Amino acid sequence: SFNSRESSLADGQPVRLYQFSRGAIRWSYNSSDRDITYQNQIFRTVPGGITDNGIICSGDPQSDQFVITAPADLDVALLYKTRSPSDAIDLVVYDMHYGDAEAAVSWVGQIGDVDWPTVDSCRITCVSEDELMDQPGLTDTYCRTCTAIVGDHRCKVNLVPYRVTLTPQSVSAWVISSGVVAGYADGWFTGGYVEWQVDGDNYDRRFIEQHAGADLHILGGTEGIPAGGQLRVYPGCDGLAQTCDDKFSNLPNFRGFNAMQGKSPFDGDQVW
Amino acid sequence: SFNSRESSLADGQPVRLYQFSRGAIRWSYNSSDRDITYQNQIFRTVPGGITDNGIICSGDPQSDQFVITAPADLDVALLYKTRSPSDAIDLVVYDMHYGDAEAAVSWVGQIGDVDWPTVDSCRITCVSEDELMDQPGLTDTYCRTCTAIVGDHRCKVNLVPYRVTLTPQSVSAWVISSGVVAGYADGWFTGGYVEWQVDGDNYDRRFIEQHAGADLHILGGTEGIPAGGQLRVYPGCDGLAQTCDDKFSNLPNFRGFNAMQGKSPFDGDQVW
Amino acid sequence: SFNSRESSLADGQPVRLYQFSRGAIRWSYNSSDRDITYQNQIFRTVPGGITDNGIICSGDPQSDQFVITAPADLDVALLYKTRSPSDAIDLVVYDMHYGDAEAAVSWVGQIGDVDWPTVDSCRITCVSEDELMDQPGLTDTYCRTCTAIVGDHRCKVNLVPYRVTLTPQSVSAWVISSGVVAGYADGWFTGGYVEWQVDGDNYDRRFIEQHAGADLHILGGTEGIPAGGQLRVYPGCDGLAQTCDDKFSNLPNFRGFNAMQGKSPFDGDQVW
Amino acid sequence: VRINAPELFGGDKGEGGLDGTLDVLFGEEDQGVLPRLAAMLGGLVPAFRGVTTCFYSGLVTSVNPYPKKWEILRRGGNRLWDGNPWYPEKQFVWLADGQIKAMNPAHILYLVYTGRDFRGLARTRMDEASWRAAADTLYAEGFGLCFEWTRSDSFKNFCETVKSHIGAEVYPNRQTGQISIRLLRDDYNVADLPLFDEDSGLLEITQEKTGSTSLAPSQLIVKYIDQIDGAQRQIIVNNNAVAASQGRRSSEEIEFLGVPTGELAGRVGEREMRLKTTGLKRYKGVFDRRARSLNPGQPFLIRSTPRGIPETVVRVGRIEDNFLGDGKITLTVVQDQFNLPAT
Amino acid sequence: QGRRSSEEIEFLGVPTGELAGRVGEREMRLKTTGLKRYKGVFDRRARSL
Ligand SMILES: [Fe+3]
Ligand SMILES: [Fe+3]
Ligand SMILES: [Fe+3]
């Protein structure tokens, strides 16, 4: 009846539904003045209303953004206030008419940017998957180092055995200290990242600038790190062939070119 | 008195005249509420009025356009509704004052674009000859083919003996069929064009995608082709030297370079 | 008290002062309706008021202009009406509150452009020193000529002995004639400039197109040259080494490269 | 042509030389087929009409199999114009005791506009009087240029380069509809030029553009190409008056590769320096119908006593007129400071 | 056309001359057939496009 209602000249009762999902956690909002139950999901009513600006599909990712307006107290947007969540918040938009149990999917995407122009409002800019095609695609260089992030699909190195679970001893503005890591050689954890559970099955990740003794340096500060929460810390690969094989014994998968050639052409001037 | 009237502080009676000409056919329009006779030519009065936006001469062809506003039923503009006429409609603009038999030429140009924003109006964009200088001017390539359109001033080939006058047997959406051309070898007419008289001494031209047996393929469809009108069809030159000389015996004027050199430099690496 | 008054919520009495300085001559203006004495300097009140548009410091010289609005009869701006003064008019802007003897410097710069949009107003565009960084900085070419303006810090040639003080015999639209220079060889003064005192310790300079006999050709016309005023005329250097040494004996400082090499590479094809 | 240089590269004791026979086919309208070329190459050999071609046969090098690149100088201009040259009495300009056979830029523009191989516009669309006057003036000034076409760009770019080189405006005349050319020279009488005043056809003048003098350059570098050898050359133009005032040295580089002689480059550089350092005054005036007949590049006088502007000579710039409706004719003008010195 | 006009288009991806001619015929037909462009306004009936 959704299509029939759209074609109807007197039963038009538009209502737009938004679904923000991050793994196992979902946030449901509706633009009407009362909650709507759809597919066993109830959508909350935001005091003040939630509205968008329209959907544009012109083939230009930079121009085809989707804008959401909502109060500054919106739960899903509140997360971005202090620090952007590590994972992207997928957004799905449905369209349905009051009194009908059928809805149609209109827009699908993820959060691109969030800002709070006024205390009584917040503007969210949503981007589609098409915008991820503007970055280069070379991803190849003939250099000495590995040119591969430890654990990627190219290194084929399993980090689960190297996982270390610990409770930090003391947390400071920029340094998190723990005695368990003090037993490892300096720089063992350099290049690794720290992941811990925020809510449900979602974890927030932070990279490590440097590891020295019992003190760990966290890039961008330690804000948001629970002082007593359980933390998982993985090591980091420098990328050198000696580092790759002595520590991880992954030399066969070494993607770097240590000593094949640095400059030698076959159309130079004098070989000697 | 035209200049005197322009300098006059109390006799200003501006009236703008437009003259659309295409060979032997002329269309005369005036912006006043009554017809004006000038040089033995009477200019019709369009119900609703005809007006422009102004004349700009800044040296930039892209910016110095001339815009005409007129109803959607204008006769001269009605031609563009279905398909643009093959020939360009030259436009000349005169200026005169009511009660005076002298007029001054203001703008000269040709139709650039026509559109119908509203059922009650039509907008015509007129371009000057200066805009034809934006296209390149290389017009030269050292390739094997002729690089010359059959019949141009460079080929120096007379197509009048090859003219064929015929009445089409059957006309379809995309194919025009005639038995007379069935007596020619396949591809004889490929590359040629069909011209027929529309009105007066003006003809509309259409190119031919392919010729096969008794069926002719017309680029862009056969719309606008009279089903019983007399049609003139000319052949087409493939551009190959063998094609040029065997069919037309125009080898001395052959502009192509068949076998002079494809790559051979005099500063290469090894001649053998 | 200036800062205290700015922080004050009830004593705000803003008043902006402008100081236009050119060497030994200063022009003082204020935006209030009465003259203000500051640092023993009294600022005139302009009938109609003087006001600006604001100060922008965004790091872009093209965008961070300062605009001044004042009547068309402003004394400092009146100079630009006929010809721009040779020297740049430095401008310093102060801020003070009525009843307080302390002022703060806000903007410093020089006149960039002046125009008179209306008979009752004039707009002055002021530019900062940052805009002088847009021009190139190569200032080096391996050519035969000197590549140095006579008298610059690179030529190290003292023009004071060559100074000639004279009273012109006759002044025309484009030619200034004097018999004293008639005693010099043709082209002796070519490339030089004429400087004369306008007011105080400021002189206006004009370059010379050509010198021939008793007649001097002035670039851009002779307008603004006093018919009886005292004029100082300096010679000009052609830039050739023979010209540099025979006339000025400054060959050791010759910055040109006469006969070191014109094309000769050490990686060519055939030395002979 | 009998080219005799068997020992150019030292002969047998060196790297060889250039010895052979050279045949040139310029590609005339009636050019025939060369029997030797067709016989040697064989197959379907056309006449190679419409294009200049050469056929070399002989020694190229010796000792080593690596032939060297060549450089050939070639003059042109008369074999163009298809079959009907236009005003040939002034087509070419002779420089340096006849060494350089420069071509008149006006002829270049006329060929580009009316050339059947370039644009093929009807010769009737060009105002003969203006073009002939421009060609006569250019020939009298001995102002020739040489160019080569390898950029494959739009006609507009090349035409703009030519105009900037010569300092001329090409516009389609509004009245007669033909293409007219006007040179920016001080070749006008003050009296005959029209005058515009508040009571004589001027409505309102808004923009003043006083300008500035402390800025602008003091030294100008002009780079040109000498056609005798094709080697890059440059000349230096200095502004002593502005240089003295300037606290620090300033320089700009302008390329006039079309200029074949240093003296001509200096002549145009003096014009550019005078224009850029004389402090032009720009005005944006509003006029009534009295300014209806003006065209781009046409100089005229303006007077406005209330503004304190005496009789001033200005050259027309951008034009925007409205004959019907608002009735507003607005013109943008610049002070007349364009002139090409002959010395 | 009163005077000759030409444009150059590069299709370096095309490996065969016949394929290049096939696409060039399409381009010529598109650029010389005189397309008509419209900017229409529709209600919800055009929602699924
Ligand atoms: Fe690795
Ligand atoms: Fe042919
Ligand atoms: Fe010197």
Numbering used by the authors:
A (entry chain I), B (entry chain I), C (entry chain I): 2 to 273
D (entry chain M): 50 to 392
E (entry chain M): 295 to 343
Give verbatim lines from the article:
The core of the baseplate is formed of a trimer of baseplate hub proteins (gp53). Residues Cys147, Cys156, Cys238, and Cys245 coordinate a putative metal ion in domain II of the upper baseplate protein.
Bacteriophage Casadabanvirus JBD30, from the order Caudoviricetes, is a temperate phage that infects the bacterium Pseudomonas aeruginosa. The virion of bacteriophage JBD30 is composed of an icosahedral capsid, long flexible non-contractile tail, and a baseplate.
